[PDB]
Amino acid sequence: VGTFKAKDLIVTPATILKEKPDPNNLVFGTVFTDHMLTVEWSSEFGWEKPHIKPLQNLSLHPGSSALHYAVELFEGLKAFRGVDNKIRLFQPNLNMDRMYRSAVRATLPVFDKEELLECIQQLVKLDQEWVPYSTSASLYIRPTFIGTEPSLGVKKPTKALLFVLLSPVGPYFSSGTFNPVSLWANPKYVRAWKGGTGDCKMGGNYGSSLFAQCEAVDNGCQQVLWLYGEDHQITEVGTMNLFLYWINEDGEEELATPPLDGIILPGVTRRCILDLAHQWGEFKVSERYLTMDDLTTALEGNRVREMFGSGTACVVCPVSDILYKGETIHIPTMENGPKLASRILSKLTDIQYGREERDWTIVLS
Amino acid sequence: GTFKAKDLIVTPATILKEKPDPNNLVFGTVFTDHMLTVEWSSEFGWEKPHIKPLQNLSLHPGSSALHYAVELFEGLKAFRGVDNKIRLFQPNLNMDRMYRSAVRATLPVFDKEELLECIQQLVKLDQEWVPYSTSASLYIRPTFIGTEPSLGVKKPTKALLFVLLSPVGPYFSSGTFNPVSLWANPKYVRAWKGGTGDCKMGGNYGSSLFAQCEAVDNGCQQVLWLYGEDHQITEVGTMNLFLYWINEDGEEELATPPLDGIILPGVTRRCILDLAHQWGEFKVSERYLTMDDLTTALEGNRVREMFGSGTACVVCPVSDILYKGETIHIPTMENGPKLASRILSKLTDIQYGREERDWTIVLS
Ligand SMILES: Cc1ccccc1Oc1cc(-n2c(=O)cc(C(F)(F)F)[nH]c2=O)c(C)cc1C#N
Ligand SMILES: Cc1ccccc1Oc1cc(-n2c(=O)cc(C(F)(F)F)[nH]c2=O)c(C)cc1C#N
Ligand SMILES: *Cc1c(COP(=O)(O)O)cnc(C)c1O
Ligand SMILES: *Cc1c(COP(=O)(O)O)cnc(C)c1O
Ligand SMILES: [Mg+2]
């Protein structure tokens, strides 16, 4: 085992620069910056030197295991141009931890988390003018890791490529204010199972979700509510972690989210919201199982305050409605402020854009 | 607007590679001279199909195939018969299964007959890759990937359908029979109810590698995939699972898990059941099998044979299973293996045209 080193970076700047888009007219993940990071690996020689070079097509053997047996994983973290014009990463160390653990589970080769993070900072620094001049826009960082073994054998790869893409993204919604979401709840589809890879950011987990999201849009919903088990546990809202703020069965004010039992992605936003909630010490915080019966029973009892999704995508996305067994079920999130959702959004946004300081942000090299 | 085989644009290779020794082959390591490629866009639909020299694909690094496993594949074989006629084997089932997988993947649909005809043209051009050996074959790998240059999780608006050919030798050195050891850890699950386990989509395989590596660590060749609280035996690696035994009612029985959505509907699986029903010599049961059923039957001397079936290994006998820290012997090779041998003979006789059958088509 070894690692590529940031001190060995070979930088090939681009001679022609692309036009930056209007920060307002940004469609998520459609526009790419001038430069990418690439690092080759072989079982024979280990990691090659890391390269920052102009964005280009990858030349892959059509046998590459990434295209056949989804021998791939990715990450999603953001760079934010603060109110003081200082560019900040947000909990990037957690994204590096999660990516290392995903590589091990994918049988892709391990790397030094610190060396990758430093390589990423160099790339963001070179293309720093892509980090949008807007307090509601950001730069998406897409670390990607693929098996390039030119062999149809189902096996641990002996060649691989780790690359990083940068994409400027506008606010999750046109305005930037809350546009509450409708969820499609069909237990017929399942995102992840116990003993699967649901708790890793591996490409395989997402391919099977598209047909379901298409079926959500057909029934006039924005996202899928992923249900697990005989008693229909609410797990995740699309590609976001699920939070329920309510009066629990014991009459206690509670923030509830499904536990990490292997079918839940340990989101960085999920980690931050739980940390904040524990820290505030104002109500009970419970990593616990939630069913549609628990929710509908609490709704008839006027015990539900707010339900919202959390991820790098939206930060905090309130839920107004769930479509389940052919009826629309209203969640009174927007009727109750949404007081907690608003508070969380303010705190994370204030940190991301350096309106306050915290350990969760690192200023760019 | 589907691509048509009539529109094929053929760019032959000017230099042809050395054909490998049919004996000294590692599976899926050697590739033929030519590949099939067909580009698709939402804006313009299907391009004309291309048969051109094997080359690297030029993909945008944002291609959805590399990020959200927007990909599927197929596996079917071409066999040079004892009469030197090249035959495909139930290829229409492979085209059906691939179409259904594309729909479930939200990849654009195509005319199954036009793809099959395009595949036959490719195999015909490279027909000398189809090995001159009654225990070797040519693997056909239709592959279908989203090339949408966008990180959005969405139905792709660009895609590529390509086909590779790879000559493959007998699964084990001689081609006689070398039984496999299975690693049975219920901690890992290949597929679940409401999943894509009944499709050949790339996502199903990426999550299997860590388990296969853990099998090789404990000196096993394959994973035995266990599902549910009562540890149902589902699949032997990337092969369907068959158990030949005296059942709980004292009846001679061929048993295999049912198609409840966690089982890949294998072509070989369908053929073995068809043959078994036809022979009418013992009971045929698509039924649930547990490790408790197996171990209870083993202590009762009721187990005759266990074997895997797939395009990979037509019939692969199982000798041993590692489960809860102990090695459990299956007496497959002690009992002939009489049934496994018979099935191997019948399918091989058909594949290599020693007898005629509806299951084979002679090459265009
Ligand atoms: C790109 C990505 C992959 C895996 C997990 C998270 C993730 O992050 C995002 C997702 C989405 N996203 C979609 O791309 C698509 C739909 C929908 F399913 F509704 F079509 N929803 C959505 O939130 C968006 C709009 C932004 C980000 C960011 N940053
Ligand atoms: C390539 C493929 C993918 C999915 C389903 C079937 C399939 O076909 C084959 C698989 C394997 N195969 C492996 O590639 C890998 C392991 C192991 F589990 F050991 F890693 N076993 C194996 O049989 C072999 C040796 C031949 C073929 C053929 N033809
Ligand atoms: C990425 C992701 C999330 C959100 O994780 P963050 O690190 O907060 O962006 C939630 N669920 C799934 C399935 C994800 O892939
Ligand atoms: C391909 C495959 C099989 C074998 O199916 P055939 O059509 O007989 O080749 C079995 N199980 C899995 C999981 C497979 O992918
Ligand atoms: Mg037609």
Side-chain angles (χ1 to χ4, degrees):
Chain A
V1 304
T3 191
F4 59 94
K5 312 162 202 288
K7 40 130 273 187
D8 287 326
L9 257 180
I10 296 160
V11 184
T12 307
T15 61
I16 298 160
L17 273 35
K18 297 178 293 200
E19 293 186 45
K20 268 82 164 172
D22 199 320
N24 308 142
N25 309 131
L26 277 172
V27 185
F28 172 84
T30 54
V31 178
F32 300 91
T33 70
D34 286 307
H35 301 94
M36 74 197 304
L37 178 81
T38 66
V39 204
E40 298 283 3
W41 177 90
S42 60
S43 76
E44 191 175 0
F45 302 119
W47 287 103
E48 305 311 320
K49 291 178 150 199
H51 275 253
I52 293 176
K53 69 191 178 182
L55 188 66
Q56 60 190 235
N57 284 5
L58 308 176
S59 190
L60 301 182
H61 193 280
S64 300
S65 58
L67 305 172
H68 291 266
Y69 315 123
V71 183
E72 66 189 47
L73 61 93
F74 68 98
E75 262 310 322
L77 63 162
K78 284 178 159 182
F80 306 89
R81 183 183 301 282
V83 293
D84 57 6
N85 216 253
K86 300 241 196 167
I87 301 165
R88 293 186 182 79
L89 301 183
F90 179 85
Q91 298 268 231
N93 302 296
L94 297 189
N95 294 99
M96 297 296 96
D97 293 334
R98 194 167 66 188
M99 189 179 177
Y100 186 98
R101 191 170 54 77
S102 297
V104 167
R105 188 62 183 78
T107 72
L108 285 161
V110 288
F111 53 89
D112 192 329
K113 290 180 280 176
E114 313 297 328
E115 295 296 337
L116 175 52
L117 180 56
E118 178 51 24
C119 283
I120 287 169
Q121 288 188 88
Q122 292 298 329
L123 181 68
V124 165
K125 192 208 153 194
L126 180 57
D127 275 1
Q128 64 174 290
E129 293 301 317
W130 289 88
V131 185
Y133 291 85
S134 159
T135 62
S136 65
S138 71
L139 187 70
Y140 193 66
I141 305 164
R142 173 46 64 85
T144 319
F145 196 6
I146 57 165
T148 63
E149 175 72 41
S151 146
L152 304 188
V154 187
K155 57 173 210 164
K156 185 182 174 79
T158 74
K159 272 177 34 64
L161 177 72
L162 193 162
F163 67 97
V164 184
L165 301 185
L166 302 179
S167 184
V169 302
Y172 191 81
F173 292 114
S174 306
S175 292
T177 42
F178 286 136
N179 285 244
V181 298
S182 283
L183 306 185
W184 175 253
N186 192 14
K188 178 192 153 63
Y189 312 113
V190 180
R191 195 190 71 88
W193 202 264
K194 315 282 164 61
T197 60
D199 61 356
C200 289
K201 232 171 172 76
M202 290 168 63
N205 307 338
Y206 302 94
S208 42
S209 79
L210 273 50
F211 188 90
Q213 172 58 28
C214 268
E215 202 184 76
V217 170
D218 273 10
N219 286 262
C221 301
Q222 288 77 59
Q223 295 294 347
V224 180
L225 182 64
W226 295 108
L227 302 182
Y228 178 96
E230 293 276 33
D231 42 21
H232 300 314
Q233 295 181 7
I234 68 191
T235 69
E236 301 215 43
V237 25
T239 66
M240 299 173 257
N241 293 112
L242 184 147
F243 279 99
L244 176 58
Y245 179 47
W246 74 337
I247 308 305
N248 68 12
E249 299 100 332
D250 298 334
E252 297 167 339
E253 197 181 22
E254 190 184 73
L255 178 53
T257 189
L260 298 183
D261 64 356
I263 72 183
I264 304 298
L265 196 290
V268 173
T269 324
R270 177 179 186 284
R271 169 49 33 221
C272 290
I273 290 165
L274 285 169
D275 282 359
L276 284 172
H278 285 305
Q279 183 199 299
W280 293 335
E282 300 181 9
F283 42 80
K284 196 179 175 192
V285 179
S286 297
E287 303 187 48
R288 58 163 285 182
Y289 296 124
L290 302 170
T291 71
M292 288 305 295
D293 272 327
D294 294 327
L295 188 66
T296 54
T297 298
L299 280 167
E300 289 145 18
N302 298 120
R303 287 163 43 211
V304 179
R305 298 283 176 270
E306 304 169 45
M307 183 191 297
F308 57 85
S310 76
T312 306
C314 178
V315 189
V316 179
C317 259
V319 177
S320 48
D321 307 277
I322 298 167
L323 271 70
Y324 177 69
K325 289 176 139 86
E327 65 168 37
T328 310
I329 299 163
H330 188 73
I331 319 299
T333 304
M334 301 314 288
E335 282 90 280
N336 295 295
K339 190 157 129 66
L340 179 52
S342 299
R343 182 183 181 171
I344 293 168
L345 180 68
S346 275
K347 182 62 82 185
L348 296 182
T349 314
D350 284 359
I351 290 162
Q352 283 164 10
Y353 287 97
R355 276 186 275 269
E356 74 173 55
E357 289 206 297
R358 264 215 80 167
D359 296 350
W360 293 355
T361 51
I362 298 162
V363 183
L364 211 285
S365 314
Chain B
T2 187
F3 62 83
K4 307 216 156 177
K6 267 189 159 72
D7 291 326
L8 257 180
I9 296 162
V10 185
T11 308
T14 60
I15 301 163
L16 299 183
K17 295 180 292 202
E18 288 224 326
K19 265 83 166 172
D21 198 321
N23 300 329
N24 297 65
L25 266 170
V26 184
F27 169 84
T29 304
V30 184
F31 293 90
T32 71
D33 288 306
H34 300 94
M35 76 197 304
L36 178 81
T37 67
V38 204
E39 296 276 20
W40 177 90
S41 60
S42 190
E43 189 175 359
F44 301 119
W46 285 106
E47 295 300 327
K48 294 179 183 171
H50 274 253
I51 293 178
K52 68 196 187 178
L54 187 66
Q55 61 190 237
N56 285 2
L57 308 175
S58 192
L59 301 184
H60 193 279
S63 300
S64 58
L66 306 173
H67 292 264
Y68 315 122
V70 183
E71 66 188 47
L72 59 94
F73 68 97
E74 261 309 322
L76 64 164
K77 283 178 158 194
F79 306 90
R80 184 182 299 283
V82 293
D83 58 5
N84 218 254
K85 299 297 183 72
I86 301 170
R87 293 185 179 79
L88 300 184
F89 181 87
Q90 301 266 231
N92 299 299
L93 298 188
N94 294 100
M95 293 297 97
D96 198 47
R97 197 165 75 187
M98 188 177 178
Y99 185 93
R100 187 172 54 79
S101 297
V103 168
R104 182 67 181 77
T106 72
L107 284 161
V109 286
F110 54 87
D111 192 328
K112 287 148 274 156
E113 272 181 24
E114 296 297 340
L115 175 52
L116 179 57
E117 181 52 37
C118 285
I119 287 168
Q120 295 203 78
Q121 293 299 328
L122 181 69
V123 167
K124 191 137 197 291
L125 179 57
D126 275 2
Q127 64 173 294
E128 293 302 317
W129 289 89
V130 184
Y132 292 84
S133 159
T134 194
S135 63
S137 70
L138 186 67
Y139 193 66
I140 305 162
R141 173 45 64 84
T143 319
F144 197 5
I145 57 167
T147 62
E148 173 74 30
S150 163
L151 308 183
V153 186
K154 57 171 272 172
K155 182 173 171 82
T157 75
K158 282 192 75 264
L160 179 73
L161 155 44
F162 68 97
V163 185
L164 301 185
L165 303 178
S166 184
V168 303
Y171 190 81
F172 284 113
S173 163
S174 292
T176 179
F177 272 148
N178 204 80
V180 299
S181 288
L182 308 184
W183 175 254
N185 195 10
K187 179 218 173 100
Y188 309 113
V189 181
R190 194 191 71 87
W192 48 93
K193 280 274 170 61
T196 59
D198 60 357
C199 296
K200 249 169 158 73
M201 292 162 71
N204 308 338
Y205 300 84
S207 43
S208 82
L209 291 178
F210 191 88
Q212 172 57 29
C213 269
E214 205 182 76
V216 170
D217 270 59
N218 287 261
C220 302
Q221 289 78 59
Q222 295 294 278
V223 180
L224 183 63
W225 293 108
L226 302 184
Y227 185 82
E229 294 277 30
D230 45 16
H231 301 319
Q232 295 174 8
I233 68 190
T234 69
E235 300 215 45
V236 185
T238 64
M239 298 177 290
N240 294 112
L241 182 146
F242 280 98
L243 175 59
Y244 178 47
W245 74 337
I246 309 305
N247 68 12
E248 298 98 337
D249 302 333
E251 298 169 338
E252 197 176 355
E253 190 185 72
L254 177 54
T256 188
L259 292 187
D260 64 355
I262 75 181
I263 303 300
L264 195 291
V267 168
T268 326
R269 181 184 181 283
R270 191 65 259 148
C271 292
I272 290 165
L273 284 171
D274 284 356
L275 286 173
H277 285 304
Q278 160 161 119
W279 292 336
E281 300 191 2
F282 42 80
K283 194 182 175 190
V284 179
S285 299
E286 303 185 54
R287 58 165 287 184
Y288 296 116
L289 299 173
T290 70
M291 289 305 297
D292 245 313
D293 293 326
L294 190 66
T295 54
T296 298
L298 277 167
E299 61 173 314
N301 298 120
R302 288 163 44 210
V303 179
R304 297 286 180 269
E305 304 170 44
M306 184 186 298
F307 57 86
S309 75
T311 306
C313 178
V314 181
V315 176
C316 259
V318 175
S319 49
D320 305 82
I321 297 167
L322 269 71
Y323 178 68
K324 290 180 175 169
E326 67 171 36
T327 309
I328 301 159
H329 187 74
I330 319 299
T332 304
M333 301 313 291
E334 285 93 276
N335 295 296
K338 159 209 158 103
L339 181 51
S341 298
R342 186 190 183 169
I343 292 169
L344 179 69
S345 275
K346 187 63 177 193
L347 294 178
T348 312
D349 284 0
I350 290 161
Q351 283 164 10
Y352 292 86
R354 274 185 275 268
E355 73 176 55
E356 292 176 345
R357 195 88 196 189
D358 291 3
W359 294 352
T360 53
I361 299 165
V362 184
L363 192 73
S364 314

